[PDB]
Amino acid sequence: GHMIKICIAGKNNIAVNSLQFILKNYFEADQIVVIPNKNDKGIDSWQKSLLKFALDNNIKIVTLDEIYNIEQIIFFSLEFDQIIKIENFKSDRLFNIHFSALPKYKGVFTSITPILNNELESGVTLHRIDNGIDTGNIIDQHCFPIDINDTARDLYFNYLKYGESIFKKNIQTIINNSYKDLKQTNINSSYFSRKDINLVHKINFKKTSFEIHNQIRAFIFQEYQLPIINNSKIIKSILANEFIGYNVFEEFENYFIISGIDGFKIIAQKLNK
Amino acid sequence: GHMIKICIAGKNNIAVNSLQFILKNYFEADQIVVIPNKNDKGIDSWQKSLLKFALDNNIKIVTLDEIYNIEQIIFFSLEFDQIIKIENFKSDRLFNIHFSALPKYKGVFTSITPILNNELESGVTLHRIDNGIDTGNIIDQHCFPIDINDTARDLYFNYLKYGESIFKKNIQTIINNSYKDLKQTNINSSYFSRKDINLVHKINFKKTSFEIHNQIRAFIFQEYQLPIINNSKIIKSILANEFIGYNVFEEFENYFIISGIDGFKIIAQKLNKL
Numbered sequence A: 001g002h003m004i005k006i007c008i009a010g011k012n013n014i015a016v017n018s019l020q021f022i023l024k025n026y027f028e029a030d031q032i033v034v035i036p037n038k039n040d041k042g043i044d045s046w047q048k049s050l051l052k053f054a055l056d057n058n059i060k061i062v063t064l065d066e067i068y069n070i071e072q073i074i075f076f077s078l079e080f081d082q083i084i085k086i087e088n089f090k091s092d093r094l095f096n097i098h099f100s101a102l103p104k105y106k107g108v109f110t111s112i113t114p115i116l117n118n119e120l121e122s123g124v125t126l127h128r129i130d131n132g133i134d135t136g137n138i139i140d141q142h143c144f145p146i147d148i149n150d151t152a153r154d155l156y157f158n159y160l161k162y163g164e165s166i167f168k169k170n171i172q173t174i175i176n177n178s179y180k181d182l183k184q185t186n187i188n189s190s191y192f193s194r195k196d197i198n199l200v201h202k203i204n205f206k207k208t209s210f211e212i213h214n215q216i217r218a219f220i221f222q223e224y225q226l227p228i229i230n231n232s233k234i235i236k237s238i239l240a241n242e243f244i245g246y247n248v249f250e251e252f253e254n255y256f257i258i259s260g261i262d263g264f265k266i267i268a269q270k271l272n273k
Numbered sequence B: 001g002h003m004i005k006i007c008i009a010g011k012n013n014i015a016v017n018s019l020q021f022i023l024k025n026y027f028e029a030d031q032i033v034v035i036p037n038k039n040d041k042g043i044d045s046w047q048k049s050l051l052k053f054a055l056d057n058n059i060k061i062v063t064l065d066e067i068y069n070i071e072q073i074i075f076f077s078l079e080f081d082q083i084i085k086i087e088n089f090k091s092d093r094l095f096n097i098h099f100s101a102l103p104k105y106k107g108v109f110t111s112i113t114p115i116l117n118n119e120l121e122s123g124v125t126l127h128r129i130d131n132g133i134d135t136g137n138i139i140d141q142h143c144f145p146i147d148i149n150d151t152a153r154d155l156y157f158n159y160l161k162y163g164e165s166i167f168k169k170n171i172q173t174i175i176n177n178s179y180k181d182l183k184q185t186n187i188n189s190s191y192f193s194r195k196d197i198n199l200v201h202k203i204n205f206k207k208t209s210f211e212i213h214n215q216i217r218a219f220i221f222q223e224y225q226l227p228i229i230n231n232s233k234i235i236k237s238i239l240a241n242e243f244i245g246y247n248v249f250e251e252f253e254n255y256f257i258i259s260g261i262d263g264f265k266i267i268a269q270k271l272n273k274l
Ligand SMILES: Cc1cn([C@H]2C[C@H](O)[C@@H](COP(=O)(O)OP(=O)(O)O[C@H]3O[C@H](C)[C@@H](O)[C@H](N)[C@H]3O)O2)c(=O)[nH]c1=O
Pocket: A078, A079, A080, A081, A098, A099, A107, A108, A109, A110, A111, A112, A152, A156, A199, A219, A221, A224, A225
């Protein structure tokens, strides 16, 4: 049918590197169109620009309106900023990679919400897009650890890495329309919206050491913000299993020593600045 | 031996039934003391009264001050209302059964917090009392399901049942002093205080059906409160696998039909239904 076979919509190194993989291995420029996010400035920053890569490689920049009527197009969202409505499209070949182990942690801020809710693991999930937010049927998932001292930033860079890999693992079956999927369960399903998360976190210290530590590290993502204790930004939290007494809080020039209601030692390292 | 070998401190069916078990199998009345909770008025209601049981069975009622200097006393807290300081006690035989699968859900309101945090299971844990809240070394634990439609009240009655069972299972080894324990992990440890739970819950509907349903049923405990939707008290929530559309909300005479962002059917039953 159409010249155009695939649309990559989204941002950051997962979208750029997945687009590069399709251009190298599957489709020529003239067979691909791209929809960057509204905030893409067309320059590289701490992630690469999808808009810049597409323009550099002669791939057309399009709008959703411009692709709705393309028969059989593969629409692939990789951190795309718009919620689509499936009945706009002639094609039913609509796919997304979501940065959580669905059915948990639908919605936004998924580098914060699993840590803040005390998880030991997260995942990336390739799924069909339906009209709900991260609700469509699951094609593949890869779960991986949230290590004990990982921050939100560390978790995000794992999503980028594992998300790119799950794209490469599954894309041929998507192209060939040969994949299998399974509906999501009602149980374990959870969802967080922007209004659920205050990005300026105020720590509750009447909590376990593990909870105070998770509260701190869930907000460490320096490109956006760092959590603040007594007007100092915190760059790293370290949780040990050493008991130091209950409810410790002491400030030093370079760090705080903290424990919660169970008394395990936390070192909260101040940003050097 | 002082005369007094054991103190049962606390309340409700677990304290009464455990006391009754001790009196039947291990110690006579004149070897036991009790410290009821401050709110025990000696009346059997939806729970049995430990004060009433002790009075009816000639078991002395005491204060903590009265038992601190008692050598070798077994002190057993079963829903006891006072945080003890261990250095007050000559004895080191100090035990509690906590209504959670420790190390999770230390603190209070443990029939609310696991449901509200989307758990599929909970537990009872027998542990040594240390100076922290529910922090001491674990002796035994029994985990059991939170069934999908269980309310906070249903979970509390399961804690009472499994707690009484874990008491009977372990009491021989406590009396022998042959029990084994293990320190708690830092990992997975969680804690909720009274301030963390608003008992008049306002539901966040911009949530999955599982989360809306957990928000409703975590507060269903009619002796205390029921959650209110559109000025109606709710007595039961039922969560189904059936997709009915995203973000459904409809009020009927006897119930609401609700779904969250994933579209699964909830029936929230009003108290007024006949
Ligand atoms: C905007 C922002 C983000 N972050 C962190 C935490 C967040 O998980 C991570 C990535 O932010 P993002 O790129 O804005 O996306 P988010 O994780 O909220 O993902 C959501 O939005 C994107 C655009 C959707 O495609 C995705 N499916 C959603 O989950 O950066 C912060 O810590 N502070 C911030 O202010």
